[PDB]
Symmetry: C6
Subunit: 60 residues, 6 copies
Amino acid sequence: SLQDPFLNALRRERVPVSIYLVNGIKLQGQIESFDQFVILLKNTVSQMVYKHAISTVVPS
Amino acid sequence: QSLQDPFLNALRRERVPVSIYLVNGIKLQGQIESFDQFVILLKNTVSQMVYKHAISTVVPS
Amino acid sequence: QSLQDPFLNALRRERVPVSIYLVNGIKLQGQIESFDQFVILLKNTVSQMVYKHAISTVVPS
Amino acid sequence: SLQDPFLNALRRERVPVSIYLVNGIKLQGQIESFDQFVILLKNTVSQMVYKHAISTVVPS
Amino acid sequence: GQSLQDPFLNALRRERVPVSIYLVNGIKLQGQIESFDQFVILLKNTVSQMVYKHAISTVVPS
Amino acid sequence: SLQDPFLNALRRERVPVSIYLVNGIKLQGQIESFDQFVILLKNTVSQMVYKHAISTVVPS
Ligand SMILES: Nc1ncnc2c1ncn2[C@@H]1O[C@H](COP(=O)(O)OP(=O)(O)O)[C@@H](O)[C@H]1O
Ligand SMILES: Nc1ncnc2c1ncn2[C@@H]1O[C@H](COP(=O)(O)OP(=O)(O)O)[C@@H](O)[C@H]1O
Ligand SMILES: Nc1ncnc2c1ncn2[C@@H]1O[C@H](COP(=O)(O)OP(=O)(O)O)[C@@H](O)[C@H]1O
Ligand SMILES: Nc1ncnc2c1ncn2[C@@H]1O[C@H](COP(=O)(O)OP(=O)(O)O)[C@@H](O)[C@H]1O
């Protein structure tokens, strides 16, 4: 797995990220936690994002 | 440990308003009544079954 | 499918007019004749097979 | 299960169908054959349609 | 339980039949089936490209 | 049998690639690594791209 260490490093280091969705929407914040299917992204509030709707995860 | 289950279980038990964004950009609003592996039942004026595969994100309103 | 199946079976056994929204935003209407793991058979003018993978939400109309 | 007898009834009676794709595109023709993952649709040509791309199959 | 997809694509590859592959977003690719596996098709055009089946709606000979 | 050798050849030889996404967006850069579900694309930065969001991968 490449996915878990990649997200874990962003989460551990509190790196601001952009999460692009498959419909072109750009979400921004910090990754707080994740599991096999979802990622918890926090900006002003915490939202649960389904990985199936995610296209790309990038440091912002 | 699932993160999805505690997140949706907290929203369900809290009975708070929730915003569900669909992959096509539509935003649904209501209370989470229950959920299983594939669907969430959202309650507003009516009770509706939402397939998780169609959801991009879930946030308390 | 501890939720999915009882939700759909009730709509089917009770012959409730339903709305089925697809992930592209199209809204189909009719009665659920039957369903299995993968598809719903919706009847209005004719019987049509809807793949669950293309469905966003099912609600009584 | 429902797919096989639904698709086979259409095949056996050679009834023209509309296959609507998840993106709204409408295909037309007759069901020639199908398997777990694809449907062969016969019109002016024989085209292989991936079920994962289909929203609905309707007698046309 | 017998595949229709595999002999279909295989025959296309075998005889170098010109195809159109339509994507789920409406984009039309053109060329020849070069190879394929469980998850991808390699389509030979003016260049060689790997196409994910999950992104494919239809494969059309013409 | 086709995907792994294809992506590894690009990675190993450091060939500049275009990754087209299901929403039409085109990403460019070098394949850093990949696993079963993701490809790490290196550009100015490292982005994790979900394969479910990819339609095509081609040398640019
Ligand atoms: N990796 C990606 N996945 C999905 N959509 C993307 C990606 N990169 C850019 N986009 C989308 O393409 C559009 C144009 O991109 P760009 O001009 O770079 O805007 P942004 O500043 O939002 O990245 C935006 O809607 C953006 O969200
Ligand atoms: N639960 C849903 N899932 C997907 N799309 C929806 C849903 N509810 C409404 N829409 C879409 O959002 C758009 C706005 O809704 P509108 O036209 O006012 O009718 P409505 O009661 O049919 O939503 C409609 O075109 C409809 O297709
Ligand atoms: N049974 C169906 N399943 C999925 N989508 C449909 C269905 N019927 C119509 N649509 C979509 O709604 C749009 C308008 O359809 P409508 O005017 O009812 O008939 P037509 O399909 O001839 O245009 C179509 O372009 C199609 O994408
Ligand atoms: N294989 C492909 N998959 C998805 N989209 C594509 C593909 N090839 C081209 N497109 C899209 O078609 C649009 C029309 O121009 P395009 O053919 O892309 O030029 P370019 O090949 O140089 O990117 C582009 O914006 C591009 O995003």
